[PDB]
Design a protein around this ligand. Structure first.
Ligand SMILES: NNNCCN(CC[C@H](N)C(=O)O)C[C@H]1O[C@@H](n2cnc3c(N)ncnc32)[C@H](O)[C@@H]1O
Ligand SMILES: NNNCCN(CC[C@H](N)C(=O)O)C[C@H]1O[C@@H](n2cnc3c(N)ncnc32)[C@H](O)[C@@H]1O
Ligand SMILES: NNNCCN(CC[C@H](N)C(=O)O)C[C@H]1O[C@@H](n2cnc3c(N)ncnc32)[C@H](O)[C@@H]1O
Ligand SMILES: Nc1ncnc2c1ncn2[C@@H]1O[C@H](CSCC[C@H]([NH3+])C(=O)O)[C@@H](O)[C@H]1O
Lengths: 343, 343, 343, 343
């Protein structure tokens, strides 16, 4: 199947085991920005669900399907590959919605549905939006979508912007500095200094930050889920040209994302921007191994290249330069293994 | 091989990927108690190493082999299955010890060593001593040990003691009661409350605690690594009969471990007890499903049965009863997926 | 002459040009601890001066000779090699002491005195006591001292102690980090990163600090000016064994000095210790390129070696080792060119 | 050599020891205005460099040579007399430019070049432009320049303007009046007050200031590097006739300078004027011994005479008078020992 072909077994096992835990579902459900915004998007666009056939891709506990049911859906096919599917069925029964919500255990790439659906709902967003590669399952599910059908979310925006944060930089540099020791209990570790720096700086930093660290207005990269094909997410090339608003050191690029539910009644946005209330996605920052100096008025140009790997994540390549000086920085990051820094 | 036969591939992948990180080796190396004690044990028993042939099982960065080199070892075979083996080789070269340290990439159950050794060194201890099941590799390596050879560490003691922690016990229900509400965004979640409870109680809790919560002198179970066969660790039955020092409610059992390096000059102890400085092993607590009241002087008797599984860990079965009362409780825990509670 | 043989002319010109400025005299004179303590030492030991013959080595503006005149000295030969000598003459005349203070322009190693003296006074101390190598001129001048003669100051004590100061260390490392850049205006500087760190950490740090950064009781090295030969100061070896009072990172060694005026009436001390009021000597810290971790109770042992060079200063080699772990650090420092950090 | 004949050994040693420090190169390199404008000047005039032969006089780190290489130069001879030459070579190698950049250690007056060059680049400007007398080395290097050749920079403009700054003026006496006391620890210092005043006034003041202190449009003195000879800089006479824009007391003359890179494509300016962003040159002010009162519309006429000395600097003689009143003032200053006032 499409899923197994792009995914190492070791990763899939761990991945679906992870979402098999009720505590993780609880943690996601207790993100009230997420949950509330989804419920609002669905309910305030109740006409897009009323007497409609719905597909919930990766229903988890089934919360989105229940929202769809509240909105008047005739039938909701709720696909879930983890053992959580068993728990969702319990809730369907205890909430007396057996006539409206149908749990279908399995991977959306593998199961069979009785009919085409009018609308697809899902929450496929991970860190930096693209982590977990669930967007591909979401897009893959469009094989079940009627020609004029809709998708909630409809579009996704990735925002990137350069930042300055000396403390974070030296925080990681310090950790890498351990391997500079010429005599750790009498052992010379310095030969591994370079490998240590590489490793630590391959980690995207997941946390929040004050918006005042940003050195320029963000660049936006948009994926239209109605138009995009699964293959489109294998290799994502995001060019950027920032117009620097402040002078100083650029220590790296900050990432966040918005998704929009473009319904018939209104458009509802779910944002993880640092200007907005915090979500369980936080924000993501990719550090340069060495900061670039730029003065206001300068342009910071380059590319962020995301290559999907078989571990349900992305290999990140960031190349950036100060156009006026030719000061250039490159870094490679492993999105699957971030550094959780929050409090 | 012996290793692959007892280990699910998926688990092995994750396991050795984990130790392939310099940051994890660093985490272990920065534990001064651990590293300092190993160094001390090796060096203060220099007669056990000088001009000897040494086997380092799971050398990681190679630190223990360097210690063996400091002690005057003639030749050290350092076996490492993770990619860390490449970094160990670098340090061997940069420390001008290629003539004395030989890095062998691969699992100790699978590689071929050219000769028998005088002493085996290793750090195979995990949470509750037995987690990770690396002790079996350590014991397996004795096929390369001369009949008169030694093991560093020579013995390992696991300690069990009953504890009282009302807040820890209540915490589980406070968390699980999230599901006990009739309208979470319109959804009745209560049917899953029981499942949430069970899930939390199956998680042993990793963190430290004040020694005053302990209600009896610990019971000790000793593994002599010189005498033991790896098969002895497939099923570890630890009977206990605690003589209660204090009166109160017993909420479960606390676990920690010591290892001893029994050299020719002296015995050096490494302890992870809650009475000692904290280590990266912390301590482990397993809850009873229901607390047991015990008076000072009463006896709390039962068994802790550790059953090895193919996820490089153990299933923990605990049964305990107050002999004077007949009050009985049990629990069944999954050690592979513990809850890290330490603040 | 002895001076020219041990001194690069370039260094001497610079040196004596520096002290030819009145603003520098003002700076020294406005150190009230220095000036007041010198006056106290001389006046409260007036009997050591009353009707005696005095040599003032490096009299500068002549202040010490005036103090000696106040104490009743019969005749004072005030030797000064800089152009300040002419300003001293002006003050001697305007203060009507022409009959008692005789300025003799030139280097004490090169001038000719009319007679032997009862006591030599001077202020030959530099940073870390030994900078400027003026102590050798002081000792050299003993050729004019009667067998029963005295020296003010009589002895000098150097104190050294281990300190912790992550900020200072990071501060210097940050400066060095400039030469890690792979693309400074498109130029790769990283090949010089090693040379840059060496240079910055070659700089002793002159400033003051909180005594709470000190991690052990200081070690003392004493020079007796009455007994020492100037040859004794070409190579100064200061071994040390610190009993660590606190656990943590040792970022280097801190230095200060005391001198004692051992008169007939009383002994007067001039101290530059961080527990005492600040002087224009401040204190001096020598950083390790890599800090050493140590626990309280551990022993930090090694050697501070001072090799006199022809730039009127010393090449400093510090080697320190944590005896319990064998963690060892070496650094070389150029005392002539310190980093003045005080603000 | 020409250099050794115009320079005392002692001055030369100190001078080249100064530029032997990476931190000093760093300080100059981190002056973005300077470094950026040079890069800009070279690159935007790429036709003056593409496939051309270049001489870099005093390359230091070699940064300008790298800029020339970026512009397409065929061959660059980079001459450097300090030990920095050894570090420049390291950078040429590590930047894979050994085929195009040839580092030549030594003084430009003493080395030999294998061929003539098309263009000379250098940064020979000191305080007040002329300090350090490196302009003479720059001009001397023209012996290697084809009759076709260009100079980058091509011209230098020194600007002079009268200023009023009552507090700067009074500061001198505040400092000198330390000596005007009859009993400093029993010593009458007053006889040296005059000497202290003279000393302070002989020091040109280095720092920046508000342009509103300027009392007249600046007078400009231009050195054309294409036309000038070394000998032209031994005696520099700058007559001036200032037309006062404001009424008040003139306390001295302010100095700053511009250089222009006159290329085939465009002219680029590097300015250190007080109307422009600050550089590490700041500005320079020479005080009059006695201020001169002028009314708006009056004319302030006189001469600034710079006489080169063998300490790689100039003796400054300024004489000025208010034509309408005949009120006259002068001053002699030593540009070698300026007072760095900037805070
Ligand atoms: N933060 N995000 N990512 C999504 C989190 N959850 C949504 C939980 C639910 N929508 C809620 O809001 O409560 C993803 C869920 O979808 C499942 N999933 C992921 N890829 C799948 C696939 N190809 N086929 C079937 N199920 C799949 C996964 O097991 C997980 O349970
Ligand atoms: N902070 N200190 N280091 C010393 C400061 N001063 C002493 C202060 C003096 N007592 C005063 O009160 O002004 C050093 C003075 O000694 C002079 N000096 C140094 N080496 C000399 C030599 N071999 N022969 C003659 N004079 C020499 C030097 O020119 C300077 O003036
Ligand atoms: N901030 N000012 N002015 C000068 C700075 N530097 C430019 C550094 C470098 N070119 C850059 O732009 O960063 C002057 C450099 O020229 C050197 N220098 C001076 N006189 C010399 C001579 N006669 N022969 C050879 N080299 C000589 C000196 O050692 C110094 O390193
Ligand atoms: N069967 C095995 N064969 C070889 N190496 C193993 C095996 N099981 C675990 N390891 C390695 O053993 C190490 C345990 S951590 C101990 C690392 C090092 N000796 C130190 O004390 O710092 C990890 O690096 C594992 O990859």
């Amino acid at each position: 199947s499409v899923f197994s072909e792009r995914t190492e077994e070791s990763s899939a096992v761990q991945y679906f085991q992870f979402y098999g835990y009720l505590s993780q579902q609880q943690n996601m459900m207790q993100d009230y920005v997420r949950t509330g915004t989804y419920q609002r998007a669905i309910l305030q666009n109740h006409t897009d669900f009323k007497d409609k056939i719905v597909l919930d891709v990766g229903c988890g506990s089934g919360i989105l399907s229940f929202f769809a049911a509240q909105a008047g859906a005739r039938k909701i096919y709720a696909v879930e590959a983890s053992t959580m599917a068993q728990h969702a069925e319990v809730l369907v029964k205890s909430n007396n919605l057996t006539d409206r919500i149908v749990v279908i255990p399995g991977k959306v790439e593998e199961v069979s549905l009785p009919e085409q659906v009018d609308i697809i709902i899902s929450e496929p967003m991970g860190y930096m939006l693209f982590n977990e590669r669930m967007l591909e399952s979401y897009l893959h599910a469009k094989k079940y979508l009627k020609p004029s059908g809709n998708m909630f979310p409809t579009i996704g925006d990735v925002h990137l912007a350069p930042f300055t944060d000396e403390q974070l930089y030296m925080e990681q540099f310090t950790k890498a500095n351990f391997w500079y020791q010429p005599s750790f209990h009498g052992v010379d570790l310095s030969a591994l200094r370079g490998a240590a720096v590489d490793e630590y700086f391959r980690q995207p930093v997941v946390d929040t930050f004050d918006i005042r660290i940003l050195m320029a207005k963000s660049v936006k990269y948009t994926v239209n889920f109605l138009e995009a094909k699964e293959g489109d997410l294998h290799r994502i090339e995001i060019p950027f040209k920032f117009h620097m608003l402040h002078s100083g050191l650029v220590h790296g690029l900050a990432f966040w994302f918005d998704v929009a539910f473009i319904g018939s009644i209104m458009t509802v946005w779910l944002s993880t921007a640092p200007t907005e209330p915090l979500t369980h996605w936080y924000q993501v920052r990719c550090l340069f191994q060495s900061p670039l100096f730029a003065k206001a008025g300068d342009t910071l140009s380059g590319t962020c290249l995301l290559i999907a790997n078989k571990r349900q994540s992305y290999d990140i390549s960031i190349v950036a330069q100060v156009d006026q000086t030719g000061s250039k920085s490159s870094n490679l990051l492993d999105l699957k293994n971030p550094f959780f820094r929050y409090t």
